[PDB]
Amino acid sequence: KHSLPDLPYDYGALEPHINAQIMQLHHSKHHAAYVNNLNVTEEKYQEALAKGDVTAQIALQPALKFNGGGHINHSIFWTNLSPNGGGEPKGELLEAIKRDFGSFDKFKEKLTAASVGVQGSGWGWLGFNKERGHLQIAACPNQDPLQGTTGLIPLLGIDVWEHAYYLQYKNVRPDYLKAIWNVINWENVTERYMAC
Amino acid sequence: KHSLPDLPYDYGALEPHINAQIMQLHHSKHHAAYVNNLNVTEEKYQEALAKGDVTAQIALQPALKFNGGGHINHSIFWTNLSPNGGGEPKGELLEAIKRDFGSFDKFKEKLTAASVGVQGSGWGWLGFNKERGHLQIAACPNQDPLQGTTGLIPLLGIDVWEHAYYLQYKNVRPDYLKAIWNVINWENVTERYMAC
Ligand SMILES: [K+]
Ligand SMILES: [K+]
Ligand SMILES: [Mn+2]
Ligand SMILES: [Mn+2]
């Protein structure tokens, strides 16, 4: 059984970059729905697996991926943001970034392009390629989780589903991305990075 | 060269079912972007085709489908709605609906389920299967146009991208769908139906 994680900060803590209304809806409505559906889906999957119903297991894949991905992605997202975030990373993460992207700004540009370029709903990710030992940028459709579908270890995720910015930035996705850099919790990204 | 079609009614004509703000953004921002990108993409495709650059043609497919689909889908959508719409269809369309779905209400339920069930961004469609001679409900991801990807002739489309309802209905997609039935231009759906 999975559960909706508590937000490490107040809903209005990311003001004015991400308003309180979006944070409240995103967390208490969208994320909550993913968790509940995930639990219901894992429930049905245990039954199908117990009696060897292969057709049932395959029919459930879309729901498990979508809701499981939704839970995974958002849980990471909440920790990637902080009212005390922003600025630039320091230490080994900054070195790894300059080394694989040229500079911190070229990195911002690459991640922003990948996020703005998502056709439809999806996520822009900064991940770690364990096999090659270097950072890597990827985009995922809908709620497809980074690690489960590409093998990359997630470090920083940017949600570009319209519900993550529409109430405040309307259709101007680039304005949303420009603003989110001010609340990125580089301390958390560093932890995830040191862990792998 | 394609162009943004004029709206057959005022931006606030669908009040209170779909507020003026969404209609204005949806048409003058979202649809306009699709048309402009479509023109730019067809431009590049003519060049690649002229010099037989097969790699260029394949690299352009995502953009042409996404923007071309966006133009096609929305152009049809605007005509599917009307300040004088709502109610139930009459004539051959109502007979075809009762015949293939049991009743008008079972049809509403089926189309609503397909639209609410779209994981991520997409469209719910009521189309005509020319090979089997019957109505059919389908859902399409992102901006994939109905006819170009499934062969079904579109009759009625319901946009479930979050930008089509978030400002007014937030995350409650079912409320948006419940309300749109009040502005469906059954006269237009009937025309598209009689045409095939
Ligand atoms: K959990
Ligand atoms: K045209
Ligand atoms: Mn989200
Ligand atoms: Mn739309």
Curated annotation (Swiss-Prot), chains A, B:
Mn(2+) binds at residues 26, 74, 159, 163. Keywords: Acetylation, Manganese, Metal-binding, Mitochondrion, Nitration, Oxidoreductase, Transit peptide, Ubl conjugation. It comes from the Eukaryota. GO terms for molecular function: DNA binding; enzyme binding; identical protein binding; manganese ion binding; oxygen binding; superoxide dismutase activity. GO terms for biological process: acetylcholine-mediated vasodilation involved in regulation of systemic arterial blood pressure; cellular response to ethanol; cellular response to oxidative stress; detection of oxygen; erythrophore differentiation; glutathione metabolic process; heart development; hemopoiesis. The modification N6-succinyllysine is found at residues 44, 51, 98, 106. It catalyses: 2 superoxide + 2 H(+) = H2O2 + O2. Binds 1 Mn(2+) ion per subunit. GO terms for cellular component: extracellular exosome; mitochondrial matrix; mitochondrial nucleoid; mitochondrion. It is linked to Microvascular complications of diabetes 6: Pathological conditions that develop in numerous tissues and organs as a consequence of diabetes mellitus. They include diabetic retinopathy, diabetic nephropathy leading to end-stage renal disease, and diabetic neuropathy. Diabetic retinopathy remains the major cause of new-onset blindness among diabetic adults. It is characterized by vascular permeability and increased tissue ischemia and angiogenesis. This is Superoxide dismutase [Mn], mitochondrial.
